[PDB]
Design a protein around this ligand. Sequence first.
Ligand SMILES: Cc1cc2nc3c(=O)[nH]c(=O)nc-3n(C[C@H](O)[C@H](O)[C@H](O)COP(=O)(O)OP(=O)(O)OC[C@H]3O[C@@H](n4cnc5c(N)ncnc54)[C@H](O)[C@@H]3O)c2cc1C
Ligand SMILES: Cc1cc2nc3c(=O)[nH]c(=O)nc-3n(C[C@H](O)[C@H](O)[C@H](O)COP(=O)(O)OP(=O)(O)OC[C@H]3O[C@@H](n4cnc5c(N)ncnc54)[C@H](O)[C@@H]3O)c2cc1C
Ligand SMILES: C[S@](=O)c1ccccc1
Ligand SMILES: C[S@](=O)c1ccccc1
Ligand SMILES: C[S@](=O)c1ccccc1
Ligand SMILES: C[S@](=O)c1ccccc1
Lengths: 411, 411
Amino acid sequence: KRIAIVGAGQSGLQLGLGLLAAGYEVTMFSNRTGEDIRRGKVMSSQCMFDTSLQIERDLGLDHWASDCPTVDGIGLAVPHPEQKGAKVIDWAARLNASAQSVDQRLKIPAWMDEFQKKGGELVFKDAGIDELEACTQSHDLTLVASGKGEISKLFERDAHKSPYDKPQRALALTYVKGMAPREPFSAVCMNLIPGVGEYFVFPALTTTGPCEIMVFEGVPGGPMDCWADVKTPEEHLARSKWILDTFTPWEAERCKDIELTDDNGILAGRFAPTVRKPVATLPSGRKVLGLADVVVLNDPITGQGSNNAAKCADTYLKSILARGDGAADAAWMQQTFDRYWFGYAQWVTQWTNMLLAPPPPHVLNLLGSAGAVPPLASAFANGFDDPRTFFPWFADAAESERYIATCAAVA
Amino acid sequence: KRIAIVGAGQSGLQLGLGLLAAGYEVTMFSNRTGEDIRRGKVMSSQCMFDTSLQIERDLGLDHWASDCPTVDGIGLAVPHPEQKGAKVIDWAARLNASAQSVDQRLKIPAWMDEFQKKGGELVFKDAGIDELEACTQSHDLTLVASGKGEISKLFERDAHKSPYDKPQRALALTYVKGMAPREPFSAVCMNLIPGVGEYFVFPALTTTGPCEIMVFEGVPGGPMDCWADVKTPEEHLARSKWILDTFTPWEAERCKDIELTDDNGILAGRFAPTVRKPVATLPSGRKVLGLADVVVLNDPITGQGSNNAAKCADTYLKSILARGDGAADAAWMQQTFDRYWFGYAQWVTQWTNMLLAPPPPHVLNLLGSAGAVPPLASAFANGFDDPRTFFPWFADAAESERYIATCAAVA
Ligand SMILES: Cc1cc2nc3c(=O)[nH]c(=O)nc-3n(C[C@H](O)[C@H](O)[C@H](O)COP(=O)(O)OP(=O)(O)OC[C@H]3O[C@@H](n4cnc5c(N)ncnc54)[C@H](O)[C@@H]3O)c2cc1C
Ligand SMILES: Cc1cc2nc3c(=O)[nH]c(=O)nc-3n(C[C@H](O)[C@H](O)[C@H](O)COP(=O)(O)OP(=O)(O)OC[C@H]3O[C@@H](n4cnc5c(N)ncnc54)[C@H](O)[C@@H]3O)c2cc1C
Ligand SMILES: C[S@](=O)c1ccccc1
Ligand SMILES: C[S@](=O)c1ccccc1
Ligand SMILES: C[S@](=O)c1ccccc1
Ligand SMILES: C[S@](=O)c1ccccc1
């Protein structure tokens, strides 16, 4: 009945709050105060699709549902190689239900407050092996939910589930006010620059109200791997507009008057996609269980990290509740992760890792056909809500052709 | 807001009831009266695992939860080729949450009564193309939920998703009272007879109270393809015991005093696993949407048909609710099925179709290792609740060995 969680993030707090509502005692370790999270740097573009949003709704945790702008579709654009400032692919499709991006600077601290108000024990410290040893002696289960924190490396990298050992994109975020709203519906506007990278943009909610989030991913060493010399917020805004001027002038038209939401609405960084083994053994021989990004870390190119966090925490919560008085031993830990991995996250991960590599011809054919076959475009858009639905037709040429034909027959 | 459903079965009635609760008008066609279903032949062994049961719970339709015996694990036995009346494999694993088998003779008629009481329009007729033409003119969406009925063949067989065009097992059911309860927990007791077939048995709820259901599947033309000469209920009980005496004497020990629950608690039959295209076009050019067994029909060897029916109806209900005022056109129909198929049922189907074929050596190695590696046995048992979790390790030798090793490391 006593559960410890190290890491006050999306998955950790969602899980902790669910556990409290089910009558558990929860101890949570945070390495930052709520206010410093609210006023510190952005951490994500956190676009959450309907299934993930519903997990939050069902826990009563959708506190921003009304104030957060909805994201109502997906758009895909590719520059025309032979026509200046034009697109050779330019289509959109509505999501069957809205997505929403609630800044973690808002959500995490408010969920920390809710966790305390609901009886959770919040302990402030940069937790290390010593805290894990203490927790495993006083609690029935200890989870590590520390995201990209250094303590996550306690869990052993799973080479067979990790095809990459190096970052595959250089990342940046810029939160802005004043962007012209997309008409006639909002979308994740995806701009695929062949051999260069990707620009994504969609509306969101941050600490100063509604905004849009510009998301940049660059092939390393390419023209969009361009944040090393950026050292001020003003330079970051400028480099953001420069990418749009240089590679997506149609989006630059929307950004004549953009300003940062705040000087901390910027980020630049990179990481290697990594899957880890879920059970870590401490020096004492006691065991801890890894949660969400600790065990499955994907590049954000597919916008799945916060979705994975919600769905991972939901699966772990269900597994804890079903266990009851049963031992929280390594076998149960491993089985809990396995259901998440084989049931769901292996397909999110395989899809994302394929998209990081150069697209093969059948993929370019799918993206083009989607502009002329609306049901295929819809499949693409709503696949973001459950990436299992891309298999087997996204990854195999012959199956992709069969699926295009299925889609064309009902257009 | 007006929906028609042809076929008053598990998926059709679950969907209809959900639609009524959401404020839709529902017309349903039934080819039998509730009472004739209650007192007619059994139709299934309908073992529903926790995720499917929860879909019913969330609609408030788990009316037998308290009276139906729980099924609390899975067991696997294989006869010893060199030791008389002994088993070379004999293991069991608990399900993380209970399964339950509520006879469709009970559930379907009670759900028909609930459907009328909740404002549904129940129309009694053996529906054909004429009723479909009428329904498609007076309703926004018409679904065909007719199971193994002849009208299901209106939907075009999908050859690429259907590796079989012939039955792969000869089936029989025998519902009995007086079987010795399994101790110390109930289970689906799976008896795999190499090259011959399978005997499954578990407790259930039928019209005369708790029982056990004996399920027989025989390789066609083999020793368990043995129901052609059976012509009375007494002969059916006798042939049931004969299989146990001949192939599973350890189960015969439990059946010294078994009697039929009723003369109609028996069934024999066979069918080819079949996947169909979900949109059918009527002579007028109007369109209908296929539901559950109409579009994805699997052999019962994996006990997934009623689970598929609950999960399919849940996905279709979610899709209808998200559509709102949107057109219920062929594109939307196809996309609704696609989410079900690519997201879930393709993996149930591939797994089941593999199990119907002779098991390759790595599969026999998995089944043996599970007897000595409890976490692998648990994976097997709980995979019945979500067969996606068998992939890729069940179907590939090298991956199966990796998963055995993962399981052994936490045993
Ligand atoms: C640029 C970018 C864009 C993204 N865009 C999207 C998107 O559009 N959609 C989407 O779904 N996902 C997106 N993601 C991913 C998403 O933000 C994360 O996957 C999600 O936050 C994972 O949740 P988590 O609970 O595993 O970790 P987090 O939410 O990161 O929580 C971990 C927390 O634990 C803390 N911590 C670390 N070490 C310790 C320690 N020793 N003791 C205590 N606390 C510690 C960390 O500081 C952090 O506060 C994006 C990520 C990035 C980097
Ligand atoms: C021997 C056997 C054992 C099984 N064991 C299991 C198990 O352990 N676990 C499991 O999950 N599944 C099992 N199944 C599968 C499960 O019973 C079915 O998959 C499930 O009933 C499918 O639901 P459905 O709504 O698609 O069809 P049904 O529940 O069969 O509903 C279809 C209904 O429509 C009626 N109908 C047909 N034609 C017409 C028409 N023209 N007009 C009106 N009505 C019509 C039919 O008579 C029937 O009443 C088993 C099946 C069999 C045969
Ligand atoms: C590169 S972005 O994530 C994408 C995903 C699917 C289809 C097209 C583009
Ligand atoms: C722009 S962020 O990386 C994203 C990408 C794809 C889908 C949703 C969100
Ligand atoms: C033949 S029965 O369905 C089965 C399934 C999984 C593992 C072993 C046996
Ligand atoms: C005995 S019925 O066919 C069954 C098989 C496997 C799992 C559950 C139910």
